[PDB]
């Protein structure tokens, strides 16, 4: 019973555009609202028609195949089918008060991928560390500090046109967490060997689908695929130094626990990983709120 909230904040990112107000009871498309009048807005950068953006719906020869693989553009939503009304997609989470695409290049789902690389925290002797409160070992994951807003986050990113989610995962992690774009060539082989063995081991899909994002509109929204590549022994990430890509101010292994503050919905993803890996999570048991 919780409506998307970030997707209804104003002004729209990178603009002064104010979204039309949407009472929570009228978020669902199923709810009748004849007077609903969303503000129309698509960023100039998207309207300019770059290679990563779709044409406007009116463009004569533009015939998108929604809810399916449409060439080098994946139009399927990972939450199932989304409705087409008035020739364009309808946000599956509901009304947002704004039509058009805002800063999103694609009509409909705009896919991203979030590679969560984890390993157990280890001491000077290479042994795991148990937390006394949970009795579980502490897990860490590779996080980057965003240059634009300085928020810590999973090193993810947009799926490029024609790119496979698996490639986006490998590419985003390497480029921003290892800085593969600027590493002794050939030495890039090893990063590929290691990431290869790492991303070849069995991973876990943590989350797929809609992401409540301030860039979302009634017609275009963000979706992600968060996947966890875990290094159980530590052998793989062992000798792989983290180096920030040019899009990150910092990069480092971050201890996982319920106190973490991360970008977007990344902390929800981290909580799920700790659950699946049976890692420590509860920092404080508020025992003092009950004990004499």
Ligand X SMILES: O=P(O)(O)OCC1O[C@@H](O)[C@H](O)[C@@H]1O
- Interface residues with Mg ion (CB under 5 A) are 157
Q: How far is the CB of 246 from ligand X (least distance, A)?
A: 14
112 lies in the binding site for ligand X (CB under 6 A): yes
Q: Could you tell me which stretch among 66-74, 92-100, 152-160, 229-237 binds ligand X (CB under 6 A)?
A: 152-160
211 lies in the binding site for ligand X (CB under 6 A): yes
The 3-state secondary structure of the chain, one letter per residue: CCCCCHHHCCCCCCCCCCCCCCCHHHCCCCCCCCCCCCEEEECHHHHCCCCCCCCCCCCCCCCCCCCCEECCEECCCECECCCEECCEECCCCCCCCEEEEECCCCCEEEEEEEEEEEEECECCCCCECECCCCCCECEEEEEEEECCCCCEECCCEECCCCCCHHHHHHHHHHHHHHCHHHCCCCHHHHHHHHHHHHHHCCCEEEEEEECCCCCCCCCEEEEEEEEEEEECCCHHHHCCCCCCCCCEEEEEEEECCCCCCCCCCHHHHHHHHHHHHCCCCCCCCCHHHCCC
Q: Could you tell me which stretch among 73-81, 121-129, 151-159, 251-259 binds ligand X (CB under 6 A)?
A: 151-159
What string marks each residue from 68 to 107 as x (binds ligand X by CB under 6 A) or -?
A: ----------------------------------------
213 lies in the binding site for ligand X (CB under 6 A): yes
- Indicate the residue among 114 and 231 with the shorter CB distance to ligand X: 114
Residue 42 binding target from ligand X, Mg ion, none, CB below 5 to 8 Å by type: none
179 lies in the binding site for ligand X (CB under 6 A): no
46 lies in the binding site for ligand X (CB under 6 A): no
């Amino acid at each position: 019973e919780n409506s998307h909230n970030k997707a209804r904040t104003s002004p729209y990112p990178g603009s002064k555009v104010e979204r039309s107000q949407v009472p929570n009871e009228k978020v669902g498309w199923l709810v009748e609202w004849q007077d609903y009048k969303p503000v129309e807005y698509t960023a100039v950068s998207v309207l300019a028609g770059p290679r990563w953006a779709d044409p406007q719906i009116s463009e004569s020869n533009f015939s998108p195949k929604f809810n399916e693989k449409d060439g080098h553009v994946e139009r399927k939503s990972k939450n199932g089918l989304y409705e087409i009304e008035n020739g364009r997609p309808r946000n599956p989470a509901g009304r947002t008060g704004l039509v058009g695409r805002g800063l999103l290049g694609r009509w409909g789902p705009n896919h991203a991928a979030d590679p969560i690389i984890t390993r157990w925290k280890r001491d000077s002797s290479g042994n795991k560390i148990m937390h006394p409160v949970s009795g579980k070992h502490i897990l860490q994951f590779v996080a980057i500090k965003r240059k634009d807003c300085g928020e810590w986050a999973i090193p993810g990113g947009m799926v490029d046109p024609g790119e496979k989610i698996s490639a986006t995962l490998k590419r985003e992690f390497g480029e921003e967490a290892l800085n593969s774009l600027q590493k002794t060539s050939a030495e890039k082989r090893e990063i590929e060997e290691k990431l290869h063995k790492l991303f070849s081991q069995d991973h876990l899909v943590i989350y797929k689908g809609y992401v409540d994002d301030p860039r979302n509109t009634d017609n275009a929204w963000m979706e992600t695929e968060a996947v966890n590549y875990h290094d159980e022994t530590g052998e793989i990430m062992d000798n792989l130094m983290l180096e920030a890509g040019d899009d990150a101010g910092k990069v480092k292994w971050v201890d996982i626990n319920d106190k973490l503050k991360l970008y977007a919905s990344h902390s929800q993803f981290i909580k799920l990983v700790a659950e699946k890996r049976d890692a420590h999570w509860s920092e404080d048991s508020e025992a003092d709120c009950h004990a004499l």
